[PDB]
Amino acid sequence: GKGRIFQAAKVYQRASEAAATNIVSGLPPRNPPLWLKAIESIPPAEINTRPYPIQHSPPNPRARKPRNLFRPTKIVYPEDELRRDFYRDHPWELARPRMIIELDGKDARFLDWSKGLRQRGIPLSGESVVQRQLWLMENQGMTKQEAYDKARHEFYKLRQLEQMERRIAVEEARMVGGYFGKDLLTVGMELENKTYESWKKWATTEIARQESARASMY
Amino acid sequence: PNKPIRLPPLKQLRVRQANKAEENPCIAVMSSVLACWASAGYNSAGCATVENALRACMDAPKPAPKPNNTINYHLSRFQERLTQGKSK
């Protein structure tokens, strides 16, 4: 046994008895620890008792001798199927950065998918399409494909305007004397130069290495 | 083809020769000198350039040692995480 006998759940019991009587028989027991009375009415919780975990999906009714009865089950929602479908149809939608750092957790209080894709607190992304799709599919009794088409098409129109604003923004800005910094295209090419030059050096060295290594074959 | 196994619990995960072992360079240069003597001959003329190269190494100063490769330290950090665990 590489473990050790922990008794952290019985500190009160053991301590309470030790403070019951004095070690010098025939005297009043000295005052107990200051913490003995603090946690008097707060017994520890029960630990190490494997319960039947929550079943997030119907268990196999055919199994006659089921195993892993005390194993937590996987959490699957109806959205999982839809998210997989959409993001497979729009793989480059994953390059759009999405923040999963919750601010206060109260982001699902102002989400009303009956209005449209645009919502308060969340950006326009594939998730908004899925939630909107699920809403139409359930409330409006639409099919998976039908709801997918409608919500998906609204997603496109909102993205088109976003891309049009960028071009018209920079263009109009220069009509009144507006100058900007290095675009992402130019910056990207510059970094390749620094990296390509480093490759030239390495190539030249190894090339010369093989040449010198070829003189020994003869 | 199977994938690399999960190492069993070892006392210490490390590499014996952390830093490469440097081979004395002109020990090869000497081999060439010996080779030429075998084919050409001891008191020949084509051995001058080869013999002079052997004298060049001994005169030249030996290089300095390289900085130690800190690889055993990082292996000790991730030992319990990579393998089954530690044994003692």
Partner: protein, 160 residues
């Protein structure tokens, strides 16, 4: 068959040793008898027969099992609720006495003596906390329940 009780005793030990909340047992007229005895003595929490999967925990006592006909008798199973208190199981040991190789029987005069910490026959006295279950014509009673009823018979198991 007595082999079922032995399997049941050994299983409840392993289930309590593994600190499990629920435990399954083959649905038989014999196992149920001893289970009710353990429950009537305060060792197990609840008893409910169901299928191969445990019933809804929140509604264990409200769980309404379906009729046990010949179409599903093979899948029925007894679900026992183990009990733990003070970081220690309440059904620690279930050593059996009457094995398939030999059925040990006790008389009323011997049970009276064993119920006060004095050996008698192939049994040993009962100490603090220990309990003995005897199978008689009045069901699977406790040694002290059989002494007040003035009966005896097959000794199933010693519960500590």
């Amino acid at each position: 068959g007595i082999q079922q009780i032995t399997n049941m005793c050994s299983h409840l030990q392993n289930a309590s040793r593994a600190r499990l909340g629920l435990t399954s047992l083959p649905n038989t007229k014999y196992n149920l008898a001893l289970a009710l005895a353990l429950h009537r003595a305060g060792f197990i929490s609840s008893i409910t027969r169901g299928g191969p999967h445990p019933p809804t925990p929140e509604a264990l006592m409200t769980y309404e099992p379906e009729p046990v006909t010949s179409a599903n008798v093979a899948t029925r199973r007894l679900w026992v609720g183990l009990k733990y208190w003070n970081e220690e199981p309440v059904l620690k040991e279930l050593k059996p006495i009457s094995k398939p190789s030999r059925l040990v029987t006790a008389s009323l005069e011997q049970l009276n003596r064993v119920a006060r910490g004095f050996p008698a026959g192939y049994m040993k006295g009962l100490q603090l906390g220990e309990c003995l279950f005897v199978n008689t014509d009045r069901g699977v009673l406790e040694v002290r329940e059989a002494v007040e009823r003035k009966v005896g018979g097959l000794v199933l198991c010693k519960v500590k």
